[PDB]
Enzyme design. Structure first.
Site, short mmCIF file in Angstrom:
data_model
loop_
_atom_site.label_atom_id
_atom_site.label_comp_id
_atom_site.label_asym_id
_atom_site.label_seq_id
_atom_site.Cartn_x
_atom_site.Cartn_y
_atom_site.Cartn_z
N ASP A 15 -34.52 37.17 -43.05
CA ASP A 15 -34.94 36.08 -42.66
C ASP A 15 -37.37 36.22 -42.56
O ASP A 15 -37.06 37.53 -41.71
CB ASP A 15 -35.40 34.66 -42.79
CG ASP A 15 -36.07 33.96 -43.33
OD1 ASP A 15 -37.03 33.78 -43.79
OD2 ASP A 15 -35.04 31.92 -43.39
N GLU A 73 -40.22 23.19 -44.75
CA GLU A 73 -39.78 23.98 -43.78
C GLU A 73 -40.47 23.19 -42.32
O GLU A 73 -40.41 22.16 -42.36
CB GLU A 73 -39.07 24.65 -43.50
CG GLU A 73 -39.18 25.79 -45.13
CD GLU A 73 -37.31 26.01 -44.66
OE1 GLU A 73 -36.45 25.84 -45.32
OE2 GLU A 73 -36.31 25.52 -43.62
#
Ligand SMILES: *[C@@H]1O[C@H](CO)[C@@H](O)[C@H](O)[C@H]1NC(C)=O
Ligand SMILES: *[C@@H]1O[C@H](CO)[C@@H](O)[C@H](O)[C@H]1NC(C)=O
Ligand SMILES: *[C@@H]1O[C@H](CO)[C@@H](O)[C@H](O)[C@H]1NC(C)=O
Length: 607
Positions: free
Chosen positions: A289, A495
């Site tokens: 990521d 997020e």
């Protein structure tokens, strides 16, 4: 095989594995490490891409050639990067990735589909496959070959800011929705070996099962945090859909920022190499990521040498740097030169990256197809998004007493009706996060139809539609309205910004519903990425619909409100009574939901 300057890896008729081995055997260490490096378009130039032998580029959220860019502007940008990569000694094309997670959502004019939590409410895997098919076409319309989807997190706590990216708290529903993968990539052939990567050709994209593993299981729903659960629970809840993704030939897997029992996933050799590669037989590539390796350490980025060693030894193949490529390449080259990371590990990473590139046809079609530009925002795909939005809606209430006339479906012919609320005419709010900007945005940010516009498109010509964003009780009582549609809910987030311990919607929302419903019968449309505190909204409302984050096609909401179709959606998550219950899942001793998983009222289509 013929001409004097023949090079086997350039021969499109040769088996993929033969092409991979032939190319790998010719590469320098610099060319190998370059394949393992993915950089932001923001730091890319022709010389950077050639000189560092770069393997991949991405756009992060909101990383665009400019605001309002056409599909052709995207294709020309991607092709310019590709021309630089194709000019290297070996001419290995780059793969360009992007977060196309509910349509090609960074791009102006792309169809925006409902977020995953609403797709979970549909219980319709074939719908989600078709959404994958349409998304592949709109991504290829912009010249991009790789979508970072699906998110197959199983969100077990709605306080998590990425809960909307999860199809369901029930792994079985998440498993079913892995049909997104053969939508985006194409169906695998009859013969197919589980764990091999697959993309059908130039009209399809590589997919990405993410984020491996347990990203939906973190303490208190804290984003990027620790998932504390035994191996049995990890394997029973969080892992199963990765196996379905292997069986469907997912090309890539992205690793989670999260930890499992205190071990960072980006440093977890046992799970990345021992399980994903060696047990599930994954043969595509494993990608980090964003600054995922930096975050192995506390503070993040405080020992980047360790970050590179731990991640590459753990088994990651491609690193989303995405900015400091010089440092990344320099450290990894030093580790290899020093014997700290064996050549076998580098050759495995490159083998997997090349396997995905040759498999998907990227060496045969490295450039964009201008004839695909018009796929962007195509009416057929909007019709599909409209279908999905309508199927995602969960009717939670339709009448205050058992004996009241049901409010829904509403009549299209009435003298005067009221449309109200912060979310009634706000396209950015109805799309939520990952739309145009990373965090989403407010107002008319792209092409679409708000709930207000959908109402005006639906009603009889004699019906007068009045919009007031936050009317007071007197305005409603004096207005001569037949009924009101009032839309409220969460603001856009993604997020960590969305981690939220109270789950109460912003004001004015409840106050507007109370003022409206106090004066006339009302249908409340709740826009949210997750269950939120709902009893006060329910107590005021005649009818209430959980519409999740339905995307650009607001007519999906009015299709059900006015009875063109019946409500069919069912909760893909538990609706809690209070946040002090959380986490609260089926089987828990304290399982006491306001509405259980699978709950949903129905209506029949108007005759
Ligand atoms: C979880 O969040 C806490 C509180 O901000 C932080 O101290 C901790 O380092 C995080 N843990 C992990 C494993 O990410
Ligand atoms: C609920 O949490 C959000 C995000 O953490 C915050 O912005 C909002 O003000 C909170 N409401 C409270 C603490 O009452
Ligand atoms: C809806 O359809 C079902 C099944 O045909 C029926 O039981 C119900 O009475 C129908 N109509 C209404 C208005 O509820």
């Amino acid at each position: 095989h013929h001409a004097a300057d023949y090079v086997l890896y350039k021969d499109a008729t040769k088996p993929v594995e033969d092409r991979v081995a032939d190319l790998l055997g010719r590469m320098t260490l610099a060319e190998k490490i370059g394949q393992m490096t993915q950089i932001e378009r923001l730091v890319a130039t022709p010389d950077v891409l050639r000189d560092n032998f770069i393997g991949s580029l991405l756009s992060g959220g909101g990383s665009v050639p400019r605001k309002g860019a056409t599909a052709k502007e995207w294709q020309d940008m991607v092709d310019g990067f590709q021309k630089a990569c194709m000019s290297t000694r070996l001419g290995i094309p780059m793969i360009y990735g992007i977060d196309a997670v509910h349509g090609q959502n960074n791009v102006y004019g792309a169809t925006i589909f409902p977020h995953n939590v609403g797709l979970g409410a549909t219980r319709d895997p074939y719908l989600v496959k078709r959404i994958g098919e349409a998304t592949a076409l709109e991504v290829r319309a912009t010249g991009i070959q790789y979508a970072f989807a699906p998110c197959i997190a199983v969100c077990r706590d709605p306080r998590w800011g990425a809960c909307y990216a999860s199809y369901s708290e029930d792994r079985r529903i998440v498993q079913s929705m892995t049909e997104l993968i053969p939508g985006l990539q194409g169906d695998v052939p009859k013969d197919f070996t589980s764990g091999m990567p697959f993309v059908a050709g130039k009209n399809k994209v590589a997919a990405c099962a993410k984020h491996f593993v347990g990203d939906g299981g973190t303490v208190d729903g804290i984003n990027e945090n620790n998932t504390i659960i035994n191996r049995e629970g990890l394997m029973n809840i969080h892992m199963p859909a990765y196996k379905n993704a292997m069986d469907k030939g997912v090309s890539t897997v992205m690793i989670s920022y999260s930890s499992w029992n205190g071990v960072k996933m980006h440093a977890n050799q046992d799970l990345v190499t021992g399980y994903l590669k060696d047990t599930l037989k994954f043969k595509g590539f494993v990608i980090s990521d964003w600054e995922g390796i930096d975050r192995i350490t506390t503070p993040a980025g405080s020992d980047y040498s360790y970050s590179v060693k731990a991640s590459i030894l753990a088994g990651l193949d491609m690193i989303m740097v995405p900015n400091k490529y010089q440092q990344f390449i320099s450290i990894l080259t030093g580790h290899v030169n020093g014997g700290v990371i064996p050549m076998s590990r580098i050759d495995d990473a490159v083998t997997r990256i090349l396997r995905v590139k040759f498999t998907m046809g990227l060496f045969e079609n490295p450039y964009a197809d201008p004839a695909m530009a018009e796929q962007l925002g195509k009416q057929e795909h909007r019709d599909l998004a409209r279908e999905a939005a309508r199927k995602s809606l969960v009717l939670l209430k339709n009448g205050k007493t058992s004996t009241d006339a049901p409010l829904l479906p509403l009549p299209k012919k009435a003298p005067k009706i009221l449309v109200a609320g912060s979310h009634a005419d706000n396209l950015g709010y109805q799309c939520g996060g990952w739309t145009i900007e990373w965090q989403g945005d407010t107002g008319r940010t792209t092409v679409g139809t708000t709930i207000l516009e959908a109402v005006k498109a639906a009603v009889d010509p004699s019906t007068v539609v009045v919009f007031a964003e936050n009317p007071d009780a007197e305005f409603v009582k004096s207005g001569g309205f037949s009924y009101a549609i009032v839309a409220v809910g969460e603001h856009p987030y993604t997020e960590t910004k969305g981690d939220n311990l109270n789950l109460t919607i912003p004001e004015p929302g409840l106050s507007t519903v109370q003022a409206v419903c106090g004066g006339v019968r009302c249908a409340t449309v709740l826009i949210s990425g997750r269950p939120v505190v709902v009893q006060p909204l329910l107590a005021a409302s005649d009818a209430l619909v959980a519409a999740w984050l339905p995307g650009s096609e607001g007519q999906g909401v009015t299709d059900a409100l006015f009875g063109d179709f019946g409500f069919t959606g069912r909760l893909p998550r538990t609706w809690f009574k209070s946040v002090d219950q959380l986490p609260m899942n089926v089987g828990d001793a304290h399982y006491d939901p306001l509405f259980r998983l699978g709950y949903g009222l129905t209506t029949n289509a108007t005759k």
